Design a protein around this ligand. Sequence first.
Ligand SMILES: [Mg+2]
Ligand SMILES: [Zn+2]
Ligand SMILES: [Zn+2]
Ligand SMILES: [Zn+2]
Lengths: 97, 166, 39, 49, 99, 76, 50, 98, 122, 55, 86
Amino acid sequence: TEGRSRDGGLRLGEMERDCLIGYGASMLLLERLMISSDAFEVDVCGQCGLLGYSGWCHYCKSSCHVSSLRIPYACKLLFQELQSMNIIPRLKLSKYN
Amino acid sequence: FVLVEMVDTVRIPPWQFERKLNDSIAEELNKKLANKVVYNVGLCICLFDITKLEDAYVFPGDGASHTKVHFRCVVFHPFLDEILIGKIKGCSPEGVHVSLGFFDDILIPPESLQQPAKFDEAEQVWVWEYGEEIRFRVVDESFVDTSPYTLVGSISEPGLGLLSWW
Amino acid sequence: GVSECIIMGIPMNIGTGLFKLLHKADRDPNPPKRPLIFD
Amino acid sequence: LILTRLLVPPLCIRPSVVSDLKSGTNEDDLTMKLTEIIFLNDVIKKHRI
Amino acid sequence: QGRFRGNLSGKRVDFSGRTVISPDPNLRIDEVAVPVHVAKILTFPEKVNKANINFLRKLVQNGPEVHPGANFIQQRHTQMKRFLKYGNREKMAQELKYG
Amino acid sequence: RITTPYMTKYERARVLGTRALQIAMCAPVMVELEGETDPLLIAMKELKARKIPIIIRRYLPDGSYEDWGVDELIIT
Amino acid sequence: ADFDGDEMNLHLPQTEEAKAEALVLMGTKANLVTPRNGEPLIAAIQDFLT
Amino acid sequence: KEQFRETDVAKKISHICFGMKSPEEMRQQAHIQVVSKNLYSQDNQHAPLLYGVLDHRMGTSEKDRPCETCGKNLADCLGHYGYIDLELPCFHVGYFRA
Amino acid sequence: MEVKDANSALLSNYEVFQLLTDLKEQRKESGKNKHSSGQQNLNTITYETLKYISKTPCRHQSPEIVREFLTALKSHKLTKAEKLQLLNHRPVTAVEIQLMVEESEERLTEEQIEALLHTVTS
Amino acid sequence: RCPDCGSTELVEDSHYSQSQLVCSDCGCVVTEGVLTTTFSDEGNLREVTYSRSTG
Amino acid sequence: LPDVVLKPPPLFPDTDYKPVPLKTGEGEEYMLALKQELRETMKRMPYFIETPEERQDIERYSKRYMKVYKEEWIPDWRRLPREMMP
Ligand SMILES: [Mg+2]
Ligand SMILES: [Zn+2]
Ligand SMILES: [Zn+2]
Ligand SMILES: [Zn+2]
């Protein structure tokens, strides 16, 4: 949350992100803005590129291509809102290698 | 039994760095491919050898050692005509239940091709007289996960004569 | 880009993420292969 | 490009607050817009009938 | 206050505090003084290894009341956290496994 | 062999972070630490002793790469 | 800062890699000069110059 | 005996492919059809209605009432979309100029 | 986790037996507690497959004998499956080659069976 | 209740700006973290009653 | 005001109008029989190229007994460009 009376935390604004970019600390920025703030694990289907649940894709009615993925929760909210706006983001996953 | 080429991304934790890389890779591949049936491949037994092993990366996440390893492993998959020798681990009215020796209890021979004295009356009666031989016919695999086994095969026993045992 | 790396929650290509690290583990590339007797 | 179906989002985007202090609740504006759209659809169907 | 600027580019995080500053010349330029009250709230996850085992044991034995110590213990096998304010902290310190 | 032989600060930070994360997960120590309960201090001691078993894989923008050892690079 | 009631934030990283990158790249001893023109910013101040 | 399936893969997203969905794909993706303009029941327990807006089959938004599609709480529920049919088609403003 | 070729090269039971013995001896010489407790199906499948191979006449074999048998059967224009089955089974009786072995028609010739028996028994 | 010992003496106590459930016998938590609405959205959300939302 | 609905409309709503029965006569039946004959004889035609089978398990003596034999039409390479020669 925002306020101290609401038991809120501090906000790393845009300028803080700019400073962290200028320093080049990629892992620190990743830990601050992704790991410690809104980290979540979603299930993405490798066939249609949509978001699944509990390792299952309701769109394709299959679960062989569904894989887990780390993501900020705000990014998943943005993807859901865009899917609500008929702007469907199709995520093409691949191995980290 | 046949060799299968596989490429696996093996993750070794940092507390296994004192061990040799190839030995740990082989152990992890054996632990990951033990008593498991790969679809359209068959039941893998163990690792045969490791052909290609490229560089070992370390990811900014977990921090372990990720290696892409090319290896060959042995699997049990007949060629639709292989002859096997199993033991009768039970019998059902619709068909006998033969199992390869301590290997897999998945062989279900249909009793529809022997001489016209074929019937199982639930008293473990194999067949009326005039180490059990087996002729694999077709392979078949299926999936498991379908909501939020996998190998049986058909077995034939023709009029082989069997001078040793009827 | 950096903005998409920050949004998607992945390490950005700039900074320390431009290169990759390798482990100096005791190994032997292209290990000896077991010879095939039947083939 | 021409829409015939509207994708109503999950409840994660439309939070619902149970205000037990009064005889009411708290629902976002998207829920009210979808309610008005369904009401207009029903009114159009009634006028067509 | 949109999603991109308010929730993607800049977002709020935990394990952070905000306090007024005061001068102190007796500290180095690369050092900063932290109050005891905030230090007991902001926690750092340290993994149990062969080096700092005897230090984490004493930290657990001290408990969340003494300043040098810990607040939560997450086991390696199960991810069920354990609060140090309740239960026998000595048994928890004696049952500290690696990882 | 065409890049700078000096080890940059970004490579230093990343190598130290990776070594600290590894040592925190029960990795073997090669410098015989003496009462260092902080993994980052052990990583810095290994870096100063030039015993970190990590090889930097510098990638060129076109796609080429090159391997450099920590003991081979120059530290400041 | 001027010590006239200004509030400052204090963050604690939750990762060894982030901690090391912060200590190395954002070290106080390693950022004694600004990248704008190389002039040192961390230097003597009032009651120290006098 | 046992089928070999991978537990977890270190998947990394390569690129995001934006696009649009046909009216049939909207029905295929959605789970239930919202046809009632009302959301709540007539009893005194303050429970929502069925096949309407705010139905728990399209996710959850309360800490006490879990989702009906997936048996998980709010922290674990990712949410489910729904499709609402319109009697007459309407121009999409975001693409209207296009 | 994809496979490149499920039928790369067929191998007899002797190679499998040798691999199982080597894995068993490397395990008993490098036994680990946690590695074994993590997955015990490995030990079970290895031991049971080794016991099944021991029940078969696959013992008393060597790579030289396999090479000699292959060179002897190469002059009989037989397919790879027939020689593989003959090596895995080691028939001592002629009836096993007469009826059980497939492709018997126009292949037995009533004279080559004696040579096949003499080669498989040597 | 306790997952290991089975003790049902779980007490709600407020941590340092954190709510969780913990047992007083073994100090093990069973559910940590709570989801609460923000006043930034509270003023935006509109009210719905049961009668109007039933017909 | 329009009434509220508790259940969604049926997936296949009933209609009071039924499709007109098909035309009858010897012509329609002959055309149907000829279309069936074309379906039956066009799959065995060499123009109907089937999916090439691959990944054979083993080679056997019965292969020559089970080898699928079928005549192949020779395309006129004079009219067809040179880029389609095997
Ligand atoms: Mg001021
Ligand atoms: Zn899908
Ligand atoms: Zn749900
Ligand atoms: Zn307990």
